[PDB]
């Protein structure tokens, strides 16, 4: 059975027909207990010195608002000039939502600019069960890519959900599950988050946030000894 | 000549100028990604004479591991712009999915060269869902998408295997059975360039 031919026939994207989209629950509990309180700061990242964000982060989730998400926007010109390397821990990770066009290439230039190498290419595959055009496009674009970079020394690389309503620009929350199940450390920054993405265990910094609670000193207090190297998957220290 | 054609050979040493121009090119290279089969070095990949196979058309380029990056380099050196990327979701016979993450997909880069015209852009979508067969085996769905995209035109595949041979496709690979050429223009230029029928140096 050819699902591409079926898509040309009916408008049902091939991904609509993927079916099925133990203790990997008590690990979620451990994450939950070691999570720092949610913290969040409203900031215009273009105009905001990123250095004032301390300490250096173990994970950075970068979700710039691309013009392609709409059919203030950030171009890859703008994204590439963020000084991400100045706030990233010597050993640390990045997850960059790259969209589905030039960003697949420019997000790689970025990752190398900031000192990462890409070890995973996580694809969000948008089904259209409930509703059966870039000039350079050759095919209909039905996915978005989140690139994962490393610097220094259970899950699949696929998120299948229904395509969000036009003008809804929210990325699948499942990305946070994938990131958190990696146990990469507890200093987690989400850049260009929104009120709706604020999450325990995460510092959210965005221009649309409507309240702030960020204090660098209070933020660093969560990781002072004996808690500085926890994976975020271990028990709290008595 | 529409029925399958193919040349057993080393794509490193074959003079691919004798084959003409192609509207679509697909390659599934043996990228050197550590750890099988005979691979090609990054420089060998860079030196492949892809630029002569097309003037205006599309390149389909399977990539994995570090070849996600290296293929983007070969694709750019060879003169294409990456304009799409197809992922094949590997499933079993009952439609369930098979370093840091388990891999449920294979990536194929889509590149464009020149200004190709008459193509049916947008008939298909950038996701394939197809059952996994032999190891290192392409899903036949990709030939259907390439046919709808560019029906009737001449296509060439590099690093194919016997099952890959298809109508309108010339298959190059070192595991094919000899030489089978039907296009007279190609037969001609092959007899000229290779009068003793052997491809070396
Ligand atoms: C010495 N120079 C050569 C070699 C050559 N070959 C032709 C036939 C095969 C050959 O013998 C060995 N290579 C592979 O089996 C091979 C394995 C794996 C992959 C990766 N791919 C797998 C399929 C995929 C899932 C769609 C996407 C990923 C590609 C391969 O090509 C190399 N033909 C001419 N000259």
């Amino acid at each position: 059975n050819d699902y591409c031919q079926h898509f040309v026939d009916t408008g049902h994207r091939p991904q609509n027909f993927i079916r099925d989209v133990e203790l990997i629950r008590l690990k979620d509990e451990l994450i939950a207990k070691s999570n720092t309180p949610p913290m969040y700061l409203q900031a215009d990242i273009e105009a905001f010195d990123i250095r004032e964000l301390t300490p250096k982060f173990d994970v950075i989730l970068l979700e710039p608002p691309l013009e392609e998400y709409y059919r203030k926007c950030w171009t890859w010109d703008d994204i590439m000039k963020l000084e991400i390397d100045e706030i990233a821990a010597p050993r640390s990770f990045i997850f960059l939502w790259c969209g589905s066009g030039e960003g697949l290439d420019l997000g790689r230039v970025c990752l190398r600019k900031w000192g990462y190498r890409r070890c995973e290419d996580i694809c969000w595959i948008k089904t259209n069960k409930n509703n059966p055009l870039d000039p350079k496009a050759v095919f209909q674009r039905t996915k978005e890519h989140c690139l994962m970079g490393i610097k220094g020394t259970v899950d699949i690389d696929l998120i299948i959900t229904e395509e969000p309503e036009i003008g809804n620009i929210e990325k699948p929350v499942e990305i946070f599950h994938i990131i958190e199940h990696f146990c990469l450390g507890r200093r987690r920054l989400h850049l260009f988050g929104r009120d709706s993405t604020i999450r325990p265990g995460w510092l959210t910094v965005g221009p649309t946030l409507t309240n702030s609670n960020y204090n660098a000193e209070t933020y660093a207090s969560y990781f002072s000894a004996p808690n500085s190297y926890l994976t975020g998957c271990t028990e709290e220290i008595e | 000549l529409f029925p399958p054609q193919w040349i057993c050979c080393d794509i490193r040493y074959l003079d691919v100028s004798i084959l003409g121009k192609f509207a679509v090119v697909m390659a599934d290279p043996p990228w050197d990604i550590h750890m099988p089969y005979g691979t090609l070095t990054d420089d060998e990949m860079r030196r492949l004479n892809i630029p002569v196979l097309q003037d205006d058309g599309f390149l389909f380029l399977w990539v994995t591991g570090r070849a996600m990056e290296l293929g983007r380099e070969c694709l750019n050196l060879w003169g294409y712009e990456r304009v799409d990327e197809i992922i094949w979701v590997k499933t079993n016979q009952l439609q369930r999915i098979i370093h840091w993450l388990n891999h449920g997909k294979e990536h194929c880069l889509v590149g464009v060269k020149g200004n190709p015209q008459g193509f049916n852009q947008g008939l298909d979508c950038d996701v394939i869902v197809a059952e996994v067969r032999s190891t290192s085996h392409k899903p036949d769905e990709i030939y259907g998408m390439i046919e709808r995209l560019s029906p009737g035109t001449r296509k060439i595949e590099l690093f194919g295997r016997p099952h890959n041979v298809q109508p309108n496709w010339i298959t190059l690979g070192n595991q094919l059975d000899g030489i089978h050429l039907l296009d007279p223009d190609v037969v001609a230029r092959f007899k000229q360039r290779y009068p003793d029928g052997i491809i070396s140096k």
Side-chain angles (χ1 to χ4, degrees), chain A residues 2-18 27-28 30-32 34-45 47-49 53-66 68-70 73-90 92-130 132 134-152 155-169 171-216 218-234 237, chain B residues 3-33 36-92 95 97-98 100-120 122-132 137-197 200:
Chain A
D2 186 336
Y3 295 104
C4 306
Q5 181 61 233
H6 203 260
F7 167 80
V8 201
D9 289 333
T10 72
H12 287 234
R13 297 162 188 189
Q15 41 273 50
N16 299 5
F17 304 115
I18 309 167
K27 172 156 111 181
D28 277 38
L30 289 163
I31 300 162
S34 51
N35 272 347
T36 63
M39 254 179 68
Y40 44 91
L41 166 70
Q42 179 292 322
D44 278 57
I45 292 150
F48 160 85
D49 177 32
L53 290 176
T54 43
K56 295 193 174 327
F57 295 93
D58 309 293
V59 199
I60 290 176
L61 173 57
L62 193 41
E63 190 181 321
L66 304 189
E68 63 162 88
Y69 295 158
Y70 299 102
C73 293
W74 281 62
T75 65
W76 286 100
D77 209 42
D78 304 316
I79 294 155
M80 208 152 32
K81 307 184 170 170
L82 295 179
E83 316 204 302
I84 297 303
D85 51 303
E86 298 292 339
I87 60 140
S92 54
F93 302 77
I94 183 164
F95 295 83
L96 176 59
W97 284 104
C98 288
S100 86
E102 57 185 353
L104 276 34
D105 313 297
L106 292 168
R108 282 169 156 93
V109 174
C110 282
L111 255 58
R112 288 189 296 270
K113 202 192 146 235
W114 304 323
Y116 307 91
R117 37 186 192 299
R118 175 204 61 70
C119 35
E120 302 293 343
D121 186 321
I122 297 157
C123 284
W124 171 30
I125 297 195
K126 301 183 249 140
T127 67
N128 69 340
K129 295 142 163 163
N130 303 324
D134 174 323
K136 306 195 324 219
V138 164
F139 305 94
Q140 268 197 259
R141 297 180 169 171
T142 65
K143 41 147 184 71
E144 304 184 17
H145 291 242
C146 190
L147 300 181
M148 169 195 191
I150 185 185
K151 61 188 333 166
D155 278 304
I156 204 94
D157 54 354
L158 281 160
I159 300 157
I160 306 162
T161 89
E162 183 88 359
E163 190 163 43
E165 323 65 51
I166 168 73
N168 186 328
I169 48 139
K171 308 311 170 196
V173 85
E174 283 83 339
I175 199 75
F176 286 94
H177 302 157
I178 288 161
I179 293 167
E180 284 158 359
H181 296 150
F182 278 132
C183 315
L184 310 164
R186 306 183 50 239
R187 312 171 274 161
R188 314 196 192 111
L189 172 72
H190 178 14
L191 278 170
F192 296 105
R194 306 169 298 289
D195 277 357
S196 44
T197 68
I198 285 172
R199 179 162 177 100
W202 283 86
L203 167 56
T204 306
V205 184
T208 59
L209 298 221
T210 64
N211 286 261
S212 305
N213 69 337
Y214 176 69
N215 182 299
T218 310
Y219 189 63
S221 101
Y222 301 137
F223 319 101
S224 61
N227 301 323
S228 315
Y229 314 108
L230 299 172
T231 64
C233 288
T234 46
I237 314 270
Chain B
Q5 312 169 60
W6 64 80
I7 306 168
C8 175
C9 63
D10 203 307
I11 285 139
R12 280 178 303 167
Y13 312 134
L14 181 83
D15 179 10
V16 297
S17 35
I18 75 174
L19 308 173
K21 310 273 130 154
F22 296 87
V24 177
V25 175
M26 205 177 45
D28 183 18
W31 305 108
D32 183 9
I33 63 193
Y37 42 80
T39 77
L40 270 61
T41 69
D42 305 354
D43 278 337
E44 272 157 329
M45 297 305 309
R46 281 190 274 257
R47 290 193 295 267
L48 293 178
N49 205 13
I50 305 313
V52 69
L53 298 173
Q54 309 194 274
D55 292 312
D56 303 82
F58 292 109
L59 176 65
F60 291 76
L61 184 51
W62 296 94
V63 302
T64 166
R66 43 172 314 254
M68 301 221 192
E69 283 69 51
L70 179 53
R72 278 175 169 84
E73 174 175 336
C74 291
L75 188 162
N76 284 319
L77 304 170
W78 299 335
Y80 299 75
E81 195 201 353
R82 202 204 49 72
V83 290
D84 255 321
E85 181 166 338
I86 305 168
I87 71 174
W88 164 30
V89 179
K90 302 182 279 193
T91 76
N92 68 28
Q95 265 47 67
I97 302 162
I98 304 268
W100 294 86
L101 290 167
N102 286 86
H103 294 155
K105 51 158 166 61
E106 304 261 344
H107 301 228
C108 181
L109 309 183
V110 190
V112 61
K113 196 181 128 160
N115 356 64
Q117 308 198 37
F119 297 65
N120 300 325
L123 268 309
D124 283 90
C125 67
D126 49 7
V127 173
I128 292 167
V129 180
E131 289 102 316
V132 47
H137 193 195
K138 275 153 284 256
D140 301 352
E141 288 73 353
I142 188 77
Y143 300 94
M145 315 176 55
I146 288 167
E147 200 49 29
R148 291 182 283 284
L149 173 66
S150 201
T153 51
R154 337 169 52 220
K155 294 137 183 114
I156 192 174
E157 171 159 358
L158 312 181
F159 309 98
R161 295 225 281 287
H163 52 232
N164 291 143
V165 307
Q166 298 280 328
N168 298 148
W169 284 82
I170 290 178
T171 313
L172 314 185
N174 64 11
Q175 270 160 201
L176 308 163
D177 204 318
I179 296 144
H180 180 46
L181 300 171
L182 303 180
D183 188 348
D185 288 15
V186 173
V187 170
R189 291 192 234 106
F190 187 84
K191 266 189 268 221
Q192 270 197 259
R193 176 73 177 72
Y194 297 102
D196 301 326
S200 198

